[PDB]
Write a protein that holds these residues in place. Structure first.
Motif, PDB file in Angstrom:
ATOM      1  N   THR A   1     -43.924   7.534  26.585  1.00 47.82           N
ATOM      2  CA  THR A   1     -43.481   8.564  26.946  1.00 47.82           C
ATOM      3  C   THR A   1     -44.098   9.908  26.519  1.00 47.82           C
ATOM      4  OG1 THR A   1     -41.834   8.350  25.322  1.00 47.82           O
ATOM      5  CG2 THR A   1     -41.288   7.545  27.592  1.00 47.82           C
ATOM      6  N   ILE A   2     -44.908   9.787  25.656  1.00 49.70           N
ATOM      7  CA  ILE A   2     -45.315  11.032  24.907  1.00 49.70           C
ATOM      8  C   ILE A   2     -46.017  11.952  26.038  1.00 49.70           C
ATOM      9  CG2 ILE A   2     -47.060  12.008  23.172  1.00 49.70           C
ATOM     10  CD1 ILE A   2     -44.866  11.213  21.753  1.00 49.70           C
ATOM     11  N   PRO A   3     -46.865  11.774  26.932  1.00 50.07           N
ATOM     12  CA  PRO A   3     -47.494  13.016  27.853  1.00 50.07           C
ATOM     13  C   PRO A   3     -46.603  13.455  28.440  1.00 50.07           C
ATOM     14  CG  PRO A   3     -48.466  10.532  27.909  1.00 50.07           C
ATOM     15  CD  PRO A   3     -47.117  10.185  27.231  1.00 50.07           C
ATOM     16  N   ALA A   4     -45.334  13.203  28.514  1.00 58.79           N
ATOM     17  CA  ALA A   4     -44.210  13.927  29.254  1.00 58.79           C
ATOM     18  C   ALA A   4     -44.329  15.505  28.796  1.00 58.79           C
ATOM     19  CB  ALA A   4     -42.971  13.504  29.076  1.00 58.79           C
ATOM     20  N   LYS A   5     -43.949  16.330  29.505  1.00 59.69           N
ATOM     21  CA  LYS A   5     -43.972  17.887  28.943  1.00 59.69           C
ATOM     22  C   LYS A   5     -43.404  18.119  27.871  1.00 59.69           C
ATOM     23  CE  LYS A   5     -43.595  21.097  32.210  1.00 59.69           C
ATOM     24  NZ  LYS A   5     -44.808  21.667  32.126  1.00 59.69           N
ATOM     25  N   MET A   6     -41.918  18.002  27.753  1.00 61.36           N
ATOM     26  CA  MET A   6     -41.435  18.169  26.478  1.00 61.36           C
ATOM     27  C   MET A   6     -41.398  17.209  25.280  1.00 61.36           C
ATOM     28  SD  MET A   6     -37.073  18.343  26.062  1.00 61.36           S
ATOM     29  CE  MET A   6     -36.832  16.474  26.305  1.00 61.36           C
ATOM     30  N   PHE A   7     -41.872  16.038  25.525  1.00 58.97           N
ATOM     31  CA  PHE A   7     -41.956  15.375  24.417  1.00 58.97           C
ATOM     32  C   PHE A   7     -43.374  15.352  23.851  1.00 58.97           C
ATOM     33  CE2 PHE A   7     -39.391  11.788  26.771  1.00 58.97           C
ATOM     34  CZ  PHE A   7     -38.400  12.143  26.599  1.00 58.97           C
ATOM     35  N   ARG A   8     -44.352  15.804  24.553  1.00 59.39           N
ATOM     36  CA  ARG A   8     -45.833  16.344  24.017  1.00 59.39           C
ATOM     37  C   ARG A   8     -45.779  17.662  23.425  1.00 59.39           C
ATOM     38  NH1 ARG A   8     -49.173  16.284  29.394  1.00 59.39           N
ATOM     39  NH2 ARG A   8     -50.950  15.939  27.835  1.00 59.39           N
ATOM     40  N   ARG A   9     -44.872  18.526  23.737  1.00 60.62           N
ATOM     41  CA  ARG A   9     -44.721  19.709  22.880  1.00 60.62           C
ATOM     42  C   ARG A   9     -44.301  19.377  21.663  1.00 60.62           C
ATOM     43  NH1 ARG A   9     -46.717  21.064  26.913  1.00 60.62           N
ATOM     44  NH2 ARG A   9     -46.204  22.885  28.092  1.00 60.62           N
ATOM     45  N   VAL A  10     -43.743  18.208  21.291  1.00 61.49           N
ATOM     46  CA  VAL A  10     -43.133  18.012  19.796  1.00 61.49           C
ATOM     47  C   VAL A  10     -44.591  17.730  19.078  1.00 61.49           C
ATOM     48  CG1 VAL A  10     -42.158  16.491  18.571  1.00 61.49           C
ATOM     49  CG2 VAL A  10     -41.153  17.031  20.756  1.00 61.49           C
ATOM     50  N   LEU A  11     -45.862  17.144  19.606  1.00 61.11           N
ATOM     51  CA  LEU A  11     -46.819  17.019  18.783  1.00 61.11           C
ATOM     52  C   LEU A  11     -47.292  18.661  18.336  1.00 61.11           C
ATOM     53  CD1 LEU A  11     -48.597  15.036  21.591  1.00 61.11           C
ATOM     54  CD2 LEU A  11     -47.767  14.143  19.361  1.00 61.11           C
ATOM     55  N   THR A  12     -47.434  19.493  19.104  1.00 65.07           N
ATOM     56  CA  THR A  12     -47.621  20.728  18.565  1.00 65.07           C
ATOM     57  C   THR A  12     -46.479  21.411  17.825  1.00 65.07           C
ATOM     58  OG1 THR A  12     -47.033  21.978  20.418  1.00 65.07           O
ATOM     59  CG2 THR A  12     -49.269  21.186  20.528  1.00 65.07           C
ATOM     60  N   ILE A  13     -45.167  21.316  17.937  1.00 67.05           N
ATOM     61  CA  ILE A  13     -44.216  21.700  17.388  1.00 67.05           C
ATOM     62  C   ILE A  13     -44.231  21.290  15.808  1.00 67.05           C
ATOM     63  CG2 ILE A  13     -41.676  21.377  16.951  1.00 67.05           C
ATOM     64  CD1 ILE A  13     -41.611  21.509  20.117  1.00 67.05           C
ATOM     65  N   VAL A  14     -44.567  20.034  15.699  1.00 69.14           N
ATOM     66  CA  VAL A  14     -44.624  19.376  14.174  1.00 69.14           C
ATOM     67  C   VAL A  14     -45.921  19.483  13.845  1.00 69.14           C
ATOM     68  CG1 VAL A  14     -43.751  17.948  12.644  1.00 69.14           C
ATOM     69  CG2 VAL A  14     -42.553  18.210  14.844  1.00 69.14           C
ATOM     70  N   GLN A  15     -46.361  19.350  12.603  1.00 66.76           N
ATOM     71  CA  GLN A  15     -47.707  19.508  11.906  1.00 66.76           C
ATOM     72  C   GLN A  15     -47.563  18.069  11.027  1.00 66.76           C
ATOM     73  OE1 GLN A  15     -48.453  22.859   9.306  1.00 66.76           O
ATOM     74  NE2 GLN A  15     -48.076  24.128  11.017  1.00 66.76           N
ATOM     75  N   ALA A  16     -48.770  17.220  11.277  1.00 71.34           N
ATOM     76  CA  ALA A  16     -48.966  16.111  10.702  1.00 71.34           C
ATOM     77  C   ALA A  16     -50.406  15.602  10.645  1.00 71.34           C
ATOM     78  CB  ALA A  16     -48.220  15.049  11.420  1.00 71.34           C
ATOM     79  N   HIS A  17     -50.897  15.178   9.318  1.00 69.20           N
ATOM     80  CA  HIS A  17     -52.263  14.774   9.206  1.00 69.20           C
ATOM     81  C   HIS A  17     -52.540  13.705  10.512  1.00 69.20           C
ATOM     82  CE1 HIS A  17     -53.155  16.888   5.326  1.00 69.20           C
ATOM     83  NE2 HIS A  17     -51.649  17.164   5.517  1.00 69.20           N
ATOM     84  N   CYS A  18     -52.068  12.451  10.021  1.00 71.85           N
ATOM     85  CA  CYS A  18     -51.951  11.553  11.018  1.00 71.85           C
ATOM     86  C   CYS A  18     -50.926  11.221  11.841  1.00 71.85           C
ATOM     87  CB  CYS A  18     -52.715  10.280  10.309  1.00 71.85           C
ATOM     88  SG  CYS A  18     -51.590   9.414   9.084  1.00 71.85           S
ATOM     89  N   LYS A  19     -51.047  10.966  13.168  1.00 74.96           N
ATOM     90  CA  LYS A  19     -49.777  10.744  13.890  1.00 74.96           C
ATOM     91  C   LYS A  19     -50.054   9.417  14.745  1.00 74.96           C
ATOM     92  CE  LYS A  19     -50.424  14.500  16.108  1.00 74.96           C
ATOM     93  NZ  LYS A  19     -51.793  14.859  15.799  1.00 74.96           N
ATOM     94  N   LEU A  20     -49.353   8.413  13.778  1.00 73.09           N
ATOM     95  CA  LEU A  20     -49.502   6.972  14.283  1.00 73.09           C
ATOM     96  C   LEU A  20     -48.544   6.792  15.303  1.00 73.09           C
ATOM     97  CD1 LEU A  20     -50.951   4.027  13.732  1.00 73.09           C
ATOM     98  CD2 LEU A  20     -48.711   3.553  12.537  1.00 73.09           C
TER      99      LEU A  20
END
Length: 196
Positions: free
Chosen positions: A54-73
């Motif tokens: 479900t990540i590639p969805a608009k809102m869900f993918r926005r979370v990736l840039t919203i939060v900072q992480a070294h490695c996103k498993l």
DNA sequence: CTGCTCGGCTCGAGTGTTCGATCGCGACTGAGGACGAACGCGCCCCCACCCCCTTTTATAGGCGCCCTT
């Protein structure tokens, strides 16, 4: 970090939250705003994302840039979809490190063997008559509710209930689910269904 | 120019959500009323020591009662 209940998210480090809350686009409550600002300010060593499909969805993918992480498993069990947005996951998170072999797990016994079956129910004459006659999409509610399959699910559930087998009925249409559940006086879960 | 086709838009319903309302309790307090506990005062009970009882002879005055006149 859940709206229904919270445990002082700022207090501790290890956190569990949801895509909807983190990527929420509308007005943010005061406490949720403070928590979100703290999350944005801090840096995360690991960002685990379950059900990455479900990540590639608009809102869900926005979370990736919203939060900072070294490695996103990313973890999931069904990494497949129709729209060609699964390829975007390779860069959104990273390359697909591994995919478990379901058949090998079944052989090893880690996963219960399943006798997958598709029960064909002949449609009743009248129901088929209206279904074919109408070009609208009432068919979703019609063919989902026919005597041959309504009798089928009832009979199958009875057979497994007397066999002491645990049943998890599924239905996309909440209307049909509620009708079946009231007719069989069973505890249907759906829609609002309070968390408690 | 016309015919066929591709993956860009849009759709209502099904979910995940959430900010905002209503209903609800709880929690608390005020005065008044009510009851309980504590202390004060009085009472009875118990415990001591001390006095008085008889018996004897003398005395003298006082007092009382009964009897006699």
């Amino acid at each position: 970090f859940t709206s229904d209940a919270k445990d002082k998210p700022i207090g501790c480090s290890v956190a569990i939250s949801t895509y909807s809350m983190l990527g929420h686009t509308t007005k943010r409550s005061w406490e949720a705003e403070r928590v979100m600002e703290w999350l944005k300010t801090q840096e995360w060593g690991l960002m685990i994302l379950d059900e990455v499909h479900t990540i590639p969805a608009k809102m869900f993918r926005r979370v990736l840039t919203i939060v900072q992480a070294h490695c996103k498993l990313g973890l999931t069990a069904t990494l497949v979809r129709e729209d060609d947005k699964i390829v975007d996951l390779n860069f959104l998170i990273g390359p697909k490190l591994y995919e478990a072999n379901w058949m090998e797990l079944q052989n090893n016994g880690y996963i219960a063997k399943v006798q997958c079956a598709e029960v064909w129910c002949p449609m009743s004459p009248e129901f088929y008559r209206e279904y074919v006659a109408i070009k609208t999409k009432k068919r979703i509610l019609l063919y989902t509710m026919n005597p041959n399959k309504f009798r089928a699910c009832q009979f199958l559930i009875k057979f497994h209930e007397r066999r002491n087998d645990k049943i998890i009925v599924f239905a996309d249409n909440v209307f049909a689910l509620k009708e079946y559940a009231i007719r069989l006086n069973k505890p249907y879960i759906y829609g609002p269904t309070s968390q408690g």
